[PDB]
RNA sequence: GGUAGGAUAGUGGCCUACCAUGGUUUCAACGGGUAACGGGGAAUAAGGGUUCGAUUCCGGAGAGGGAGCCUGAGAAACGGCUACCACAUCCAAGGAAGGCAGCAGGCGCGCAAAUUACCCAAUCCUAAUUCAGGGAGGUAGUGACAAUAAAUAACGAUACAGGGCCCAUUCGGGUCUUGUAAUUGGAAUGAGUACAAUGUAAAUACCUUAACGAGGAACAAUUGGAGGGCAAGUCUGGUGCCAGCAGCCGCGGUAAUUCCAGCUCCAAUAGCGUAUAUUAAAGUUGUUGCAGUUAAAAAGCUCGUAGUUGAACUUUGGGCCCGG
RNA sequence: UCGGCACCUUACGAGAAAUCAAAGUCUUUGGGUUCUGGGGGGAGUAUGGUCGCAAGGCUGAAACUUAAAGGAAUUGACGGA
């Protein structure tokens, strides 16, 4: 865990978590 | 609904529960003055702190400032009256220099021993509490009675409660009742 | 012993001013045989119900349960 | 944090501790007379002064 | 709430009655009367706490219901009768005439007087105003209305009330050099007549007063009661003349008469 | 001028800045947001009774190695599920399944004590008959 | 906000009619939360502060919720009424009745909080009233909330402790007995129990006291500890990374100073531990008084409004007199 | 000599030190002022608002978990130095 590489993993999950709310809306 | 009956605590505890310096010193005090607890030491230490801080703010004022002239000379007068502060050395610098054994000497348990009459401090406390020694003609069974330098002459065995006169005593009677019972008429 | 004392100018004028329990103590009065505290208050509240001398309800009820 | 360890062994050591009773002794005094008995045993009738003072000397 | 209160809590009483904190939950509430609730002294407080004639508040009732006490010559059988300042209290038996005046500590003195002084009293003029049918009247500090005064009598003065017929005998004008009895606050019970009077048009007039020992003390005009000329009081002053000996001087006297 | 404003008229900017930076404490953020009553199973209390479901044996954390002998407790007042340590040699035989226990915090104001993972409460009384006074010999458990 | 009226006990947008477009806000309005009644005050505190205040006094509000009203000087009253809502009682089913956030009590909630006792004697209050009434109040009961004082032993002869005298020579001598003898002595007293008196409204208790009342003076003090922090054991028996302890660091895998026990010792002592909160500790909230290179912390940079802050300059000195 | 980018030497001082004429004039603590921090994670995450065509930006938690994480220097050890 380089914090930059944890970031692009998190930014991936930031998209998916706001996809699953637009999925349910 | 009534007046709240005012109460206060008469002692305080050290900030450190186990100091070798403090625990040996007080056990020396408790065996010297025949004390029961450290609470009897903590009581005097709490009296000293208020008395010491009652002069520290007074000394921070001017001198001839009349509160210091009133409260300070009244502060000395009670200490001089009780025997803690001597008949010489009457100043606010010398109420700060007071210590625990100054007050402990003025206890009735100490003075019943200091004025003859007790042959221990551990026999002094079991004379006082056992309804012997009177101070005026008043029977005192309090060991921290704190004799006040004018009562010392009249400290004596009580008019009642033998060692003071007029009656034998409880187990003295029953022995003499038994000694009369077993011997004869 | 220390107390507080009174000597009145006459025995009858003692009896005017002195409280009753002191006079009960000395033989100069008898404690009244009133009923108890709650029994008085219970009897007072039962008698708050009736409006008047109650002889009329006494004769009406004794008429009604007789027949 | 496995939540299901064996519970059959609870109180094992206390049960297989052999019961040895407290020995009946003459009583010790209370309050002022015990602070008197501490005064002799630390400042009047003390003898062993090893290091500074040892109130519980273990047998060597 | 919902109207007038009938109870006085002990420890909500005025402090100058010297009522003990314990041994009873309630204080004697002053009734409606000539003087205010916090400026008066109920008869139970006088006859039990100040004179020690009554032990209870029941013996205050047993005294007043035999027509013994009389405030201003009238009997006033109320236990909580609000006898206040300058009130002459006559006891027929014991022959004692008292005048309720302030001792210098700010309390009510147990101050005996005699019958020629008990025959009258003083009253500070509260207001001068025309009544109906044009009749002028003056209002005193005990709420007495007296008709047809001297036209020279103004507010803040003092009149001498004959107390049998409630008539103005003479009046002491309010001017410089005349004995001021301070009647409220921390200066309660202090005499000394004058320095001057400062106006403050708008409210709360202030009066500068310097006593026998030349101690100036400023007081509001509404606590000022004029009781005479220079010297020569119109009433008997209490044991101490309102001088305010300080606590250093107060400890000096009590040691001066406790060794005899 | 060492950071802060010093001036006479700057009492507000100091007082706003104090409250702003006051939130970073552990107790002030907890007390003023009220998480004792909202979160935190013992809702601001000190002791909470509960009903015993289960007897868990929790593994002690490494480098220690023992089975810690807790119980699982549903609180009577709240219905929340907690794990409660049963402290002494033995004393798990003293609890039961399905009876009342008085609990407490264990002592670290939360923050599970030592080698015991997640267990932050202990047991004071079972049946109101006081585990310590049961453990010695002093009291007997109520049979029925 | 103006003008006029109505209403009021009266001021007043209090309401009504007409007219004007105001009033508040980054100096935090408006809004949301409060396990918020406000104050006197309380805990802790070198100083500054921090936290609490339902609660013996004072002011407010409320009597299940709301709303309306009668009487009366005084109430939008609740131990008054009326209505609805909610709850709930008796009934012969037509009806009728209710309001303990008064006092005692019950249930429930709970971690959590006592008597269905005695009296108006005190304090005071009410009334036609000196008399009557008073769960206001006072008295007792239960009561380790908190606070005060302070028993559980004391003093000796006997044993050996040793500090010794005249060089005790080698101990006697008229030493000086503190510790030690599950020895031996005669004294002291209240805990308790009671003749009585006092107390009290009546008692109970205290205060006083006749007769009784300690030899294991069983008339027995406990609560926590004994590796460090922290005062006190590398004693003995058991267990064997189990059981368990331990706030934290850490002890347990066969010699465990840390577990469980015996012994001994330590701390506080009629108290002590535990939990939670809060205060000091904490100069880890920093006004006093914190830190920002690298430990967490200078905005990427500049402008700029509120805020905060802002150069110097205007009667100086001298002489005299009174005067604590 | 004025102003600037730096540097060199010393260390009066400062600091935990590495170092620093500023990082000094700091318990002998007050020239003015802005912003930020409060043990490590969770987490620059969730949610809400806001900005952007979007990627994302700005604001920004808590539950829960943890007894250390970290800074600087010393000695060793090791380096496909
Ligand atoms: Mg006696
Ligand atoms: Mg009321
Ligand atoms: Mg600033
Ligand atoms: Mg108008
Ligand atoms: Mg108008
Ligand atoms: Mg009008
Ligand atoms: Mg509330
Ligand atoms: Mg408050
Ligand atoms: Mg309040
Ligand atoms: Mg109301
Ligand atoms: Mg009426
Ligand atoms: Mg109503
Ligand atoms: Mg009412
Ligand atoms: Mg009611
Ligand atoms: Mg109803
Ligand atoms: Mg009740
Ligand atoms: Mg309780
Ligand atoms: Mg009464
Ligand atoms: Mg009551
Ligand atoms: Mg005993
Ligand atoms: Mg006695
Ligand atoms: Mg140690
Ligand atoms: Mg062993
Ligand atoms: Mg042991
Ligand atoms: Mg500090
Ligand atoms: Mg810091
Ligand atoms: Mg950093
Ligand atoms: Mg920069
Ligand atoms: Mg940057
Ligand atoms: Mg600006
Ligand atoms: Mg300037
Ligand atoms: Mg240059
Ligand atoms: Mg943090
Ligand atoms: Mg952000
Ligand atoms: Mg977002």
Task: Kindly describe this structure.
Chain B: InterPro entries: Ribosomal_uS4 (IPR022801), Ribosomal_uS4_CS (IPR018079), Ribosomal_uS4_euk/arc (IPR005710), Ribosomal_uS4_N (IPR001912), S4_RNA-bd (IPR002942), S4_RNA-bd_sf (IPR036986). Chain B: One of its GO terms (cellular component) is 90S preribosome. Chain B: It holds the Pfam family S4. The structure is cut from a larger assembly and holds chains A (25 residues), B (185 residues), C (67 residues), D (60 residues), E (260 residues) and F (144 residues). Chain C is an all-alpha fold and 67 residues long. Chain C has helices spanning 11-17, 20-25, 37-46, 55-64. Chain C starts with 10 loop residues before the first helix and ends with a helix. By secondary structure, chain E is α+β, with helices and mostly antiparallel strands. Chain E has 3 domains: 1-116, no CATH class; 121-171, no CATH class; 174-244, no CATH class. Chain F is of the alpha+beta class. Chain F has one domain. Helices cover 20% and strands 20% of the residues of chain F. Chain F contains 4 helices and 5 strands; from the N terminus they run αααβββββα. Chain F has helices spanning 11-22, 26-33, 35-38, 131-135; strands at 49-54, 70-75, 81-85, 100-105, 121-126. Chain F has a 5-stranded mixed β-barrel with strand order 1-2-3-5-4. Classes of the chains: A mainly alpha (25), B mainly alpha (185), C mainly alpha (67), D mainly alpha (60), E alpha+beta (260), F alpha+beta (144). The D-F interface holds D 1-7, 9-11, 13-14 and F 55-59, 67-69, 89-93, 117-118. One magnesium ion (MG) is lined by residues 4-5 of chain F. Chain F binds 2 RNA strands through helix 1, helix 2, helix 3, strand 4 and strand 5.
SSE diagram, text form:
The structure is cut from a larger assembly and holds chains A (25 residues), B (185 residues), C (67 residues), D (60 residues), E (260 residues) and F (144 residues).
Chain C lengths: L10 H7 L2 H6 L11 H10 L8 H10 L3
Chain D lengths: L11 H5 L15 H13 L16
Chain E lengths: L7 E2 L16 E2 L13 E2 H8 L7 H7 L4 E3 L10 E2 L4 E4 L5 E3 L2 E2 L3 E2 L3 E2 L1 H4 L2 E10 L5 E5 L4 E3 L10 E4 L6 E5 L7 E3 L12 E4 L7 E5 L5 E5 L3 E3 L20 H10 L4
Antiparallel strand pairs in E: 1-2, 3-5, 4-6, 6-7, 7-10, 8-9, 11-12, 11-14, 12-13, 14-15, 16-20, 17-18, 18-19
The complex binds magnesium ion (35 copies).
Chain F binds two RNA strands through helix 1, helix 2, helix 3, strand 4 and strand 5.
